Design a protein around this ligand. Structure first.
Ligand SMILES: O=C(O)c1nc(Cc2ccc(Cl)c(Cl)c2)nc(O)c1O
Ligand SMILES: [Mn+2]
Ligand SMILES: [Mn+2]
Length: 143
C-alpha cells in the first residue's frame, strides 16, 4: 500500500482501537475490539495516552489481514500518521515516538489496502465505546 483508502473496505475486518494511561502511575493499556468479535489488550509500563494510541494501532495492523479498516478516536495518532503518508507522497522519507511511528508506517506499506478513520471519543459509537471501556479499566478512575 502507498496510499490510504478514501472509504471503508467492504468485507474487511474493522478494528476499533484506543488507549488509556494513568498520569500518576504511568501505567497504561492499548487495545482493539473488532466487528468480527475479536479483542486484545496489552498493558504498558511508563507510557502516555499518546503512546498507547499509537501502540493500539500497531496491534491492529499486526493482527489484521492484508485489508483492514481501523477506527481511532485519537486526533494525535491520525494526525501524526497522516502527516507521514502525505509527506511520503510529496517529500519522501516526527520527533516524539519516532521508533513507534516508524514501526506503524512499515506495517502500513505491506498491507494491500488500509482505511484509517477518526471518530469522536465518548459519542456512543459502539465499537469505540467498547474498546475505551477495555483499556480504561484499572487505568482511568472516572470519565
Ligand atoms: O483519544 C482521546 O483523545 C480520548 N480523549 C478523551 C477525552 C474526552 C473526550 C470526549 C468526552 Cl465527552 C470526555 Cl468526557 C473526555 N477520552 C478518551 O477516552 C480518549 O480515548
Ligand atoms: Mn482515545
Ligand atoms: Mn478512550
Amino acid at each position: 500500500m502507498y496510499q490510504l483508502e478514501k472509504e471503508p473496505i467492504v468485507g474487511a475486518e474493522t478494528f476499533y482501537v484506543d488507549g488509556a494511561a494513568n498520569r500518576e502511575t504511568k501505567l497504561g493499556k492499548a487495545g482493539y475490539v473488532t466487528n468480527r468479535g475479536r479483542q486484545k489488550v496489552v498493558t504498558l509500563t511508563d507510557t502516555t495516552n499518546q503512546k498507547t494510541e499509537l501502540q493500539a494501532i500497531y496491534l491492529a495492523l499486526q493482527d489484521s489481514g492484508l485489508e483492514v479498516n481501523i477506527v481511532t478516536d485519537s486526533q494525535y495518532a491520525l494526525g501524526i500518521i497522516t502527516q507521514w503518508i502525505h509527506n511520503w507522497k510529496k517529500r519522501g522519507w516526527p520527533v516524539k515516538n519516532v521508533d513507534l511511528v516508524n514501526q506503524i508506517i512499515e506495517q502500513l506499506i505491506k498491507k494491500e489496502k488500509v482505511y484509517l478513520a477518526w471518530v469522536p471519543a465518548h459519542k456512543g459509537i459502539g465499537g469505540n465505546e467498547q474498546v475505551d471501556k477495555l483499556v480504561s479499566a484499572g487505568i482511568r478512575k472516572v470519565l
